[PDB]
Amino acid sequence: KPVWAPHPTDGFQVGNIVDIGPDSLTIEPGKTFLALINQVFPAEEDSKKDVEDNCSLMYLNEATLLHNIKVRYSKDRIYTYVANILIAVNPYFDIPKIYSSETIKSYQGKSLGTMPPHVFAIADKAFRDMKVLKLSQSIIVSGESGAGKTENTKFVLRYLTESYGDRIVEANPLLEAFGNAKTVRNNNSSRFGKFVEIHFNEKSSVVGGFVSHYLLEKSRICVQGKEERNYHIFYRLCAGASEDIRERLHLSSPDNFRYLNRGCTRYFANKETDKQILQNRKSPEYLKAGSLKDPLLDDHGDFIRMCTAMKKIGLDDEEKLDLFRVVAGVLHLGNIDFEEAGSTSGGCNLKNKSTQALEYCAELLGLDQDDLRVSLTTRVMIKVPLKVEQANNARDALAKTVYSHLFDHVVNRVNQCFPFETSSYFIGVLDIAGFEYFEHNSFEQFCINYCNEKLQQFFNERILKEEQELYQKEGLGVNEVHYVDNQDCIDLIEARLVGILDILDEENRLPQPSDQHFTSAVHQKHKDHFRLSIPRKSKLAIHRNIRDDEGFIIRHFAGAVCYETTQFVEKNNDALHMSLESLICESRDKFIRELFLSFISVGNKFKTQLNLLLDKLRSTGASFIRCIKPNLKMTSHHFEGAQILSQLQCSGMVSVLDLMQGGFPSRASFHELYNMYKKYMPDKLARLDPRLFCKALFKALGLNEIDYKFGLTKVFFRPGKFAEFDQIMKSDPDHLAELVKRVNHWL
Template sequence: MSVKDGDGTTSQDGKAYELQIYPRLSLETASCCILRVTKEATAASVIRDAAETLGLDTRKLYVLAEVKECGGEEWVLESTDLPVHRVLLWPRKAQEQHSQKEGFYFLLQERNHDGSIRYVHLPTVGNEQESKRLVARGFLPPQQEDLEDLCNLPVLNEDSILDNLRIRFQKKKIYTYAGSILIAINPFKFLPIYNPKYVKMYENHQLGKLEPHIFAIADVTYYAMLRKHINQCIVISGESGSGKTQSTNFLIHCLTALSQKGYASGVERTILGAGPVLEAFGNAKTANNNNSSRFGKFIQVNYLESGVVRGAVVEKYLLEKSRLVSREKNERNYHVFYYLLVGASEEERREFRLLQPEEYFYLKQENFMIEDADDLRHDFERLQQAMEMVGFLPATKRQIFSVLSAILYLGNVTYSQKSSGREEGLDVGPPEVLSTLSDLLKVKEEPLVEALTKRKTVTVNDKLILPYSHSEAITARDSMAKSLYSALFDWIVLRINHALLNKKDMEESVSCLSIGVLDIFGFEDFETNSFEQFCINYANEQLQYYFNQHIFKLEQEEYQAEGITWHNIDYTDNVGCIHLISKKPTGLLYLLDEESNFPHATDKTLLAKFKQQHQQNHYFVPTPVMEPAFVILHFAGKVKYQIKDFREKNTDHMRPDIVALLRSSDRAYVRQLIGMDPGAMFRWGIIRASIRALAAFNEAGRRWAAKTAGVVRPNSRVPLGELQRSNVPIERMYRKNKNPKTRQLIPKNLLDTRSLKYVVGLHDRTTKSLLHLHKKKRPPSISAQFQTSLSKLLETLGKAEPFFIRCLRSNCLRRCK
């Protein structure tokens, strides 16, 4: 470090100030020079003295830059600027000793050969005029123009596209067009660009007239539907953590806001409330995303020809049931469990027998800690509000939370080999867990224990009861938990659809238009990939094919048909990968179903069949003989899948003895969840409501009779006491449901059989397959159900005009900077 006096100019107060000047090169090792200067010392004089002190070539041109690391700022001083005046604006500690470690210092920078300056900290220029001045003088590099539409780039290649997206993102412009496609980059923080005024600002504007925005896509879709009288759809795609779910929420918000022509039907409120409910029960924290959708959903918003919302339908795809019982490291179970356990009141904790999260096997993980308790409490309040918006009554919410608690207690059931006597089988416990589970599900403890430790097998001439092995018992326990949660999720989706239904949907005379928003799981490639990732990535292959068809193939065919001069664009066609997975008869999904039906087949025999049939397929990459895995070359890259549990997950149905146990429950809601018909719970609710109304009427009659005692009147009816002593089914139902204090589970406005039948017709009926209720016919596998629902989705998309939103992650660490 060297010290030298400045130019000797005397200041008015006669005081000298120290400036520490660092050279640009080798900042970590180079020593600084300290100059003693006055307030009136200019940047030019400081540069001259610093260059001499540091022994630099004084014939070269240098500039002095003020660095503020805390704000990421680096400002070049003009020759007449006064450095001391800048120092006096710094924090006191930085003024006393402005070393690099304090984050405030001066930097001596040599100009480049072209006259420009290379920066360590690119300046964030807040003043547009100051920015232009510095560019003109060569103190800042020329600003590269950011283009709102990538199609307008003068040179169109991967580098120019990425550079344009990066420049816009650094300016907090997260949306960019590529023609009619919107590219959305997840900033991992909330930006103030979604206020209602923005909905109004983008209303009825052509795409590209204003700055790119997701509201612009919603607006152009809405008005295209009204103008063309053609259904529209918006397909959102991107890898996990790229912001698809949040983009869906913004779209739904805008689409419902656009429809409010001076009045609202109330459906908008229900649609907006459905989002948080589905997220709570269907989203979870994963390695790549704190709010990852573990199911796919297609929300179809229906409109009258006037543009007013009149109803909506939610379709769900492939809930990841395995997450309920096992997860990868640093991942979580579904959000709703943590919301309930952290956010429940003391009264609710007692009612649902809640423990701490780390006390549940299904939630416990290594180094498990709840660090976001305040956020979880807030999210639980938000969930309660959203459930009310959808129409869940307080009694319904309590029933749901009680089932969630029972599912968690199922994970705490443990098994051990019987240690006494010659009797084979398992001991199950702990006793307090079984007692609590029995109480929450309202089933008797003895048949509960039997269902968790033994299986019933029906032969031609006899019925056998065989004890489970330890591994089989664990599988049966987990299967019961997964099936119960899946049935609960199906019921919630059905319930939301019933609330979203407008009775005009059942009148054929009412014309209807729709906009569908598809938010489906993004392409996944984890450290360990299983059956769920296989199905998810297959769905992404299908959507990529749909995208290619509309953006490339159909567009080029239209140009050629119209005689337009056009050079065909080569694009990656993924139809070969789709055929590998789903083409009959040797597609991987069909081979999986085939092996799932063979009682003696294993995951090993399944993998061998995969390799035998497709070892020459370009998209099927062979693995070493002993490795229990296979690799598929997807459009987004190679993914290795572990074959373990493929067969089990493909035939994940609840065993009939578990179904019989739950059907014996004294809790009506539990019986409804596992009913054969997904609409049975509503019909049963209607019957119970009628019986309770009859009981209330009888009670009122008795009270009136008591007041008018002594009045003689003819009575030819059977005495009520005798009526109650009869044992016909309707009387047993009456006695069970006559309590007028029993809370209603279904709002009065939904007790309508016509609307019920319509909603059940829309439902995908997976519950029946899930519960294995077919007596003669084997239920369809999970992959077969998924293929069917995916085909139905693609058929719906094929009948609509599509818009596409491509979501990207700004970084892999989910950081907001």
């Protein structure tokens, strides 16, 4: 029989065992290679078939899991179950029909396994659980950058509002314009986290929604790498705005703006949409290299779609122009340059070249030109002149705070489109920025990856720990599955006083803060810690010349990442000098007013916000969608086996599949079940042990003895029995009577 043995790029390959040695099996893919006995797995007999639930495989192991997902992917089936957990592999193209209104209708009220695997089925299951258990629900959509979390979040939201309700759906282009950006991992990367709650009444009908937003990436506002961009809105506005709007806002091609021109200044466009962009909007880079290519994104088309979206959800033209005005104001702010004053003030002056930028910025932000000049080049502390570098920092700090408060306003404005006075329960969907790394990793990556650690820990806690504790408490005798927990990595980062975030905070507060001093402290205070290393020990050449006090490696659950620690101290400080806060809070423009040691910890904001979020998640029933990124090239039909296997492993899916060999995803109190059916029962079953009625019910419903197991207080059901479980659980008088009548006929 063919078996699975290791392959360095496919993860596993098919072969036959031709020989055996002390520590090896000899695998024929006349040619042979050696494999460890424990690295060789049985294969499914039919290599061309697939199963919708990996629990249905004859052999449950990482190799058969990988292959099943692969076969499905090759047939454009991106969704596959492991019991009630969904695996979604990014197709990197639009699969026809699978998100249609017809498809949506077909999933309504269907138990898991009665329809093909789909995000819609996870959404419907959350809805069903909310109704049956009278408990708010969370759907956690996890995965690395570019895996498909945001797309799947949108599908869930569309499903729920279309089935059980639209403005929640329609508002999305607005959030993405202000909070998403091109990174090298994802053309449409989310640079903020969100928890979107759909709220329901007692009849389980949608009454409104609420979007909680988290931790916008502020550094991106001012600078980007050459392959990356600022937030979409800048490019959508420059590409799509009318000439009247362009003139009023003094806009031009992106290369004319410091806050855009260190990044990629090319638009997403195709042959057709390029013709719709006016010549005066195109940068030299765009004219030379042409447009950026994407199946989803198009700067001109997205500007139009965004404006349509704004109108549909109730934003008036004044509101729209206000938003654009602040965006342009931030752009002109960035164009203000400073120079050495010399012995006059000892500080700096605005460059003569920056006169227009000062004028435009002041006009758009409702500020007096001189007030802005003074606030950027001096500070009362005595009114002292600032040095050029401090002026640069003042400018950028103001820009970041203005844009960030604008984003806050956008999210608030969105919430105002679907408000509700009261609700019974909610279904919330969590979409965070996912695990990411690059040639050069900084504090932004450190914070993003920390959040991903925390979320993986929640999965481990809910699915691998608590599940097994339940089986144990109920006396089920399910074989224990051991796994590598990541709490130690979390503690390295967030522990009081000694954790990296607190050591960083300590540095910000020292007389002479230093990235090197901070980095040395991290290594010194964490001698021998398993989750920390020095850059010279990196697996990658690019990191080998970083000094011990210039970086560190964190052994994340998803892989080791080497961080350069330059700018960690400055990036940890969210504070805005009162001079700048006062300037903007006293703007002559109402809209801008309504948006609104010197040290505020960014790291402590990551920790505090995540812990609040985790509190909310812990109070809800949780469902999980594990998004998988198939390759690093954003291409369709390119399944990178080893890459995908790595994700299945670190996400915990291999551990979960192991547990499911003998686990039970569905359960209820058998006393409560008996109590529910009691009023309809004939004396002959009413008199017997409550487990006996249950057994009679199960058998009448066609369940076999192996499908269920009675614990101490709860009855448990195996994977693939969700349909029968859902039938048993219905509390409707008609349905209870129906099933008892079936039992009566069975007897």
